[PDB]
Structure 1
């Protein structure tokens, strides 16, 4: 599910929260004017994951990519904080969100 901390951080930004997304594609592109990391949902929505050249965005963007990659490979849900101001929309946070059953 979604952590309260993740919801609170997305509420402090213009980016929109997207809950319980199943990612089915991750791509890396080095073509001259289309460079970057793209992810797509089961519903056919695409996002761009921005990179980072300087501390701390360098390690943080690398962790965003690791999470997106594991979600596609392991078929595990994520929550996103995404800016609609771009095409495709830009991921500014990602949360790995394995679905756990609570039987009580």
Structure 2
């Protein structure tokens, strides 16, 4: 049921510690809102941290992303993300599609 989103331009990066709305969020050029995952323990805290790095990276640089998201929230929750440099003819990678065409 995991949803693939492709070629998102992230334009807004949000840190928020207000209760009932804490966590990190991104906003798409078209106003898609997603929440970034989070994790205390190894090994996901590695990946959730790199989610934050990647997300910042796009908003700062204009770079595109590809998201494996859950439309079982609102804002949705980013379950995996791919950062892509300019000059890539294709959008998402085949390896990235396949992994989310599974959960």
What TM-score comes out, normalization by structure 1 length?
A: 0.81
- For 1:7, the equivalent position in structure 2 comes to none
d(CA) in 2 for partners of 1:59, 1:41: 24
- Is 1:99 the counterpart of 2:86? The answer is yes
Mark the runs of 5 or more structure 2 residues left unpaired by the alignment.
Answer: 90-103
Unaligned runs of at least 5 residues, structure 1: 1-13
Equivalent position to 2:21, from 24, 34, 37:
34
Across the two proteins, how many residue pairs are aligned to each other? Answer: 89
What does the per-residue CA deviation read over 1:27-55, in whole Å, with 9 as the maximum and x for residues that have no partner?
01011211000001111110000111111
Are 2:79 and 1:79 equivalent residues in the alignment?
no
**CA–CA separation in structure 2 for the residues paired with 1:41 and 1:98:** 17
In 2, Cα distance between the equivalents of 1:76 and 1:88? 21
1:62 corresponds to 2:43: no
Give the superposition deviation at 1:15. 1.3
Give TM-score, length-normalised by structure 2. Answer: 0.82
Runs of 4+ in 1 over 3 A off after TM superposition: none
1:8 aligned partner: none
Root-mean-square deviation (CA), in Å? 1.1
